[PDB]
Design a protein around this ligand. Structure first.
Ligand SMILES: *[C@@H]1O[C@H](CO)[C@@H](O[C@@H]2O[C@H](CO)[C@@H](O[C@@H]3O[C@H](CO[C@H]4O[C@H](CO)[C@@H](O)[C@H](O)[C@@H]4O)[C@@H](O)[C@H](O[C@H]4O[C@H](CO)[C@@H](O)[C@H](O)[C@@H]4O)[C@@H]3O[C@@H]3OC[C@@H](O)[C@H](O)[C@H]3O)[C@H](O)[C@H]2NC(C)=O)[C@H](O[C@@H]2O[C@@H](C)[C@@H](O)[C@@H](O)[C@@H]2O)[C@H]1NC(C)=O
Ligand SMILES: *[C@@H]1O[C@H](CO)[C@@H](O[C@@H]2O[C@H](CO)[C@@H](O[C@@H]3O[C@H](CO[C@H]4O[C@H](CO)[C@@H](O)[C@H](O)[C@@H]4O)[C@@H](O)[C@H](O[C@H]4O[C@H](CO)[C@@H](O)[C@H](O)[C@@H]4O)[C@@H]3O[C@@H]3OC[C@@H](O)[C@H](O)[C@H]3O)[C@H](O)[C@H]2NC(C)=O)[C@H](O[C@@H]2O[C@@H](C)[C@@H](O)[C@@H](O)[C@@H]2O)[C@H]1NC(C)=O
Ligand SMILES: CC(=O)N[C@@H]1[C@@H](O)[C@H](O[C@@H]2O[C@H](CO)[C@H](O)[C@H](O)[C@H]2O)[C@@H](CO)O[C@@H]1O
Ligand SMILES: CC(=O)N[C@@H]1[C@@H](O)[C@H](O[C@@H]2O[C@H](CO)[C@H](O)[C@H](O)[C@H]2O)[C@@H](CO)O[C@@H]1O
Ligand SMILES: [Ca+2]
Ligand SMILES: [Ca+2]
Ligand SMILES: [Mn+2]
Ligand SMILES: [Mn+2]
Lengths: 239, 239
């Protein structure tokens, strides 16, 4: 039984348990700002940032065929300061190949390079998409389950509570192969739920890096904040 | 596409859209008290009460083989006034044969007659169990998914926020056959999630009654309240 877990009630600058990539930065106030925020306090466009836990996770074993069950919880806030242009692009929790570097930003959220469903990506993600690309459903924002593609296999529209903290819970039961995610806004009491069957043995490599990635838009001011306040994770491999 | 829906932001006494059975009663304050509350304001033991929506729901069609997707949301509160004996028994959201009457109370929650897994029950339920019977896991309270039996196929322990309002969301996606439930306590911000694969065509009859049932214990003072503040439901049959 290989178990791994971590819990950050807040982030500390200089911490060596997190790998910051791109624009990602931990403020002195303990907040993880995935995307860049200017001197004037406004979110910068054309920005991509990621944060990966410093240790790889054993998600499944090819020898025994066993797969781990896991759960992650995190709180974030997205603030959209401008009426026009439309804000973009969103943030995502993901699992993929170890030692990875940021991919394409914008609508690809820093984890994909195109809009193809390619098995070589070996990536599983739960997105919180704020901009409707041609591969997206018309409603934004939306939660989406991404399996080797930015074209979600399942989406769930939600209403953004501008600048309010949202609580997220993502759980994966290896026995039933169900990936269930929940988004709750304590401010308004709104609850959103989404679930889909995902066999990680068909998607991910045995060892993966777990992280959070965020991206702002491809044009001036098509931006918003992607702030994370806490993040915990736990995985248990019967093997 | 056969759709049916209802939404009760509060309950009105005398309403003919709800079938009250057993001890169930709607107060002048708009609260649905599933189980009996004495003159002294304390919950009575040996009490069972149910509330069924007055119209049957078309859940699946045998001719076309199509099955409906549905979602229900409700708020309730359980108050446990005594340290001893242990409180009991809990409440449950259920779907089963039309024109049904209350079954055994106590640990059977008013919807089962024994602890056998019998296909003739044709009942699907999501319980919020407060007393650990011999067929129950040791942890209480717990959320459970019941399929033709009081012995849940899946359980999830949760911490009771005594007398606080809990918000529940239960969703069923016919395409994936996933039944996902969420319990949130706004008071503490606690979020609980549970999911399992359930093929309703193998469990329920084509037409069903949807309801809520609650029960108090088999001995003096083994009791608690089972108050419901609101309840909404919607189902869509592609046929
Ligand atoms: C957040 O970051 C923290 C800081 O990095 C993490 O804590 C570190 O976790 C390290 C485990 O990876 C741990 O490393 C060991 O350190 C031992 C010496 O330090 C302790 O003992 C000292 C006295 O002897 C004392 O003064 C210190 O205060 C510590 O108590 C050392 O003996 C160990 O070496 C043995 O094991 C390694 C690995 O098998 C062998 O390589 C080695 O030969 C020997 O057999 C080990 O040393 C580390 O070895 C690998 C090498 O690359 C590293 O440089 C070397 O440090 C380290 O002690 C702590 N640091 C502190 C200050 O406690 C923290 O990890 C979590 O908490 C720790 C305690 C542990 O339980 C981990 O499993 C947890 O993940 C990070 N938190 C998270 C959630 O990631
Ligand atoms: C909560 O309870 C409410 C009260 O019971 C529900 O509202 C009732 O819903 C009934 C539908 O089942 C509806 O019944 C129809 O009433 C028609 C006459 O009343 C209307 O028109 C009057 C003037 O003509 C006006 O004064 C009234 O105020 C109403 O506007 C009547 O013509 C209908 O009859 C036709 O259809 C039936 C069924 O096919 C045939 O049997 C009949 O031959 C004729 O063709 C119909 O009458 C009902 O027929 C069945 C019989 O057993 C009933 O006794 C008879 O009433 C009724 O009007 C309303 N009541 C009110 C005050 O609006 C409410 O239902 C929801 O809302 C209604 C409007 C409808 O949209 C339903 O689908 C909804 O479920 C309940 N809410 C919920 C969530 O359950
Ligand atoms: C100046 C201009 O019109 N530029 C557009 C880009 O904005 C556009 O890229 C999209 O931009 C939105 C935000 O406006 C999101 O970032 C989205 O993910 C991007 O794809 C591109 C391609 O559509 O076209 C011009 O370059
Ligand atoms: C007086 C006494 O000990 N009576 C017990 C019953 O309580 C018990 O039934 C259980 O009672 C608990 C609450 O105490 C729950 O209601 C539970 O669901 C019941 O099964 C029965 C059977 O165990 O034994 C005596 O009758
Ligand atoms: Ca998008
Ligand atoms: Ca029980
Ligand atoms: Mn999307
Ligand atoms: Mn139980």
């Amino acid at each position: 039984v290989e178990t791994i877990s971590f819990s950050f009630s807040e982030f500390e600058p200089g911490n060596d348990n997190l790998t910051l990539q791109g624009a990602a930065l931990i403020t002195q106030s303990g907040v993880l700002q995935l995307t860049k925020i200017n001197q004037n306090g406004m979110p910068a466009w054309d920005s991509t940032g990621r944060t990966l836990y410093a240790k790889p996770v054993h998600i499944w074993d090819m020898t025994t065929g066993t797969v781990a069950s896991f759960e992650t919880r995190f709180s974030f806030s997205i603030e959209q300061p401008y009426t026009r242009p439309l804000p973009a692009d969103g943030l995502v929790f993901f699992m993929g190949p170890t030692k990875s570097k940021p991919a394409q930003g914008y609508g690809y959220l820093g984890i994909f390079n195109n809009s193809k469903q390619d098995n070589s990506y070996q990536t599983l993600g739960v997105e919180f998409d704020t901009f409707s690309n041609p591969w997206d459903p018309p409603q934004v924002p939306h939660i989406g389950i991404d399996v080797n593609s930015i074209r979600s296999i399942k989406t769930q529209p939600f209403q953004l509570d501008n600048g309010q903290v949202a609580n997220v819970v993502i759980k994966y039961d290896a026995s039933s192969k169900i990936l269930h995610a929940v988004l709750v806004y304590p401010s308004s009491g709104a609850i959103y739920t989404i679930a889909e069957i995902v066999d990680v043995k068909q998607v991910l490599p045995e060892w993966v890096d777990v992280g959070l990635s965020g991206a702002t838009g491809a044009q001036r001011d098509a931006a918003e904040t992607h702030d994370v306040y806490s993040w915990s994770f736990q995985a248990s491999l019967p093997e």
